[PDB]
Amino acid sequence: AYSLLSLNDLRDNVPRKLKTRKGRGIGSGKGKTAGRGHKGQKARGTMKFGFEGGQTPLRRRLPKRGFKNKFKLHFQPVGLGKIAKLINAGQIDSHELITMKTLKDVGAIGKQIEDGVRLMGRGADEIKWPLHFEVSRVTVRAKEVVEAAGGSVRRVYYNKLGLRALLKPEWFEKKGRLLPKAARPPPKQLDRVDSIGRLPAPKKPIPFYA
């Protein structure tokens, strides 16, 4: 058995638990009506799970509510604490612009971005530098904390195709398409943003009143 790997002594970590074959003799404990009792509907096996006996069920005595919005926007939340931790880890450059592509490449954003990034205020006591951001939405605490250190946050607009072209520019060149052009916001989305995004990923910020 000195490092021997033969087909005669392979076994697992625990012994294998075998099937409970119902309907065998007396000594197995599960024979003659298996585990079904005597007569009725549950011994003949014609019973549907969730039936309530003829009483009007809870799923029909309670009222419906609301409607479904088919144009609902989903933004991925990032806190300031994760961004500060990745700044201190030396993975995010603190002197260049922090776009959404930077967060997607470092991994603060998960696998599927949907409509953009919302900047959150969690871990706001770790921010010690003037950082420049370009996100989709930002909360009041996060904007206040950033501009109290001297940075700026710009709310910027991309659509779905523009987000694909910002994040995966090699996907267009494997397909033979030219890089598209950034689209203007619709009038219901005009007030929520500051400016149209640039479709190459920009690395120099744009000061507001300078």
Partner: protein, 91 residues
């Protein structure tokens, strides 16, 4: 004459898309009851949010305290929430 019910029927027959005659999904997937959908909403706690009954009509039958009480959202009881947990409602 021309009421909202038959106006909606005429609109839905012409403009709403039609169900396919036959299915395309070869895989078998689990379906729960269709009356769960617009009535319940699962929370990340693990409990399921519901809204109380009695607010549709008959407000002259109820006390003031009950009218104030039925405005408050509640939770599904556990023995009934386990059924929808087992029938893939909470994903």
């Amino acid at each position: 004459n021309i009421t909202s019910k038959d106006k909606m029927a005429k609109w839905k027959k012409k403009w709403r898309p039609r169900t396919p005659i036959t299915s395309k999904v070869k895989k078998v997937k689990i379906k729960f009851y269709s009356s769960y959908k617009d009535r319940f909403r699962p929370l990340n706690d693990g409990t399921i949010l519901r809204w109380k009954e009695g607010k549709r009509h008959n407000a002259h039958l109820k006390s003031k305290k009950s009218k104030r009480r039925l405005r408050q959202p509640g939770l599904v009881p556990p023995a009934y929430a386990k059924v929808m947990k087992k029938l893939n409602f909470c994903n």
